[PDB]
């Protein structure tokens with residue numbers, strides 16, 4: 001029965017080790033992402049949460065019919 | 070926020086041009102021909118400085 005239907009314990013053991021590593025990495029990545037989102041939303045210095053401002057390319061820098069703009 | 074500096078009333082004195090608008094309009098073309106140099110200097114000063122206090126002379 002053991003020869004025909006199953007494997008040794010080392011296979012399940014090391015598959016479990018691989019599964020555990022994947023899951024623990026995913027967990028720490030999730031926590032880190034939550035912290036990064038908190039900081040990027042509070043500070044606005046990150047690539048995320050960039051709210052539009054006015055394009056400076058719309059300003060007209062030509063003499064404006066009076067000297068003081 | 071800081072004090073605004075202003076010229077004294079002495080530095081704002083000048084010999085005025087006390088002729089009316091009809092006289093000025095009758096002379097305007099020759100006046101623009103003859104007095105072009107200081108007028109253009111003043112307008113360039115005025116439009117580069119953006120401050121009337123910097124173009125009194």
Ligand SMILES: CCCCCCCCCCCCCCCCC[C@@H](O)O[C@H](CO[C@H](O)CCCCCCCCCCCCCCC)COP(=O)(O)OCC[N+](C)(C)C
Nearest residue numbers: 001002003004005006007008009010011012013014015016
């Ligand atoms: C000797 C007599 C006295 C003792 C009798 C012993 C009793 C044993 C017989 C009972 C059958 C066991 C039930 C089957 C459960 C096993 C299912 C599965 O685990 O088996 C797969 C293997 O497949 C097997 O073939 C299971 C198929 C059994 C299907 C039973 C169907 C019987 C129906 C009877 C119909 C008869 C004719 C009908 C006429 C109308 C495993 O997949 P595998 O990917 O390898 O895993 C890797 C393991 N390696 C490395 C060892 C290869």
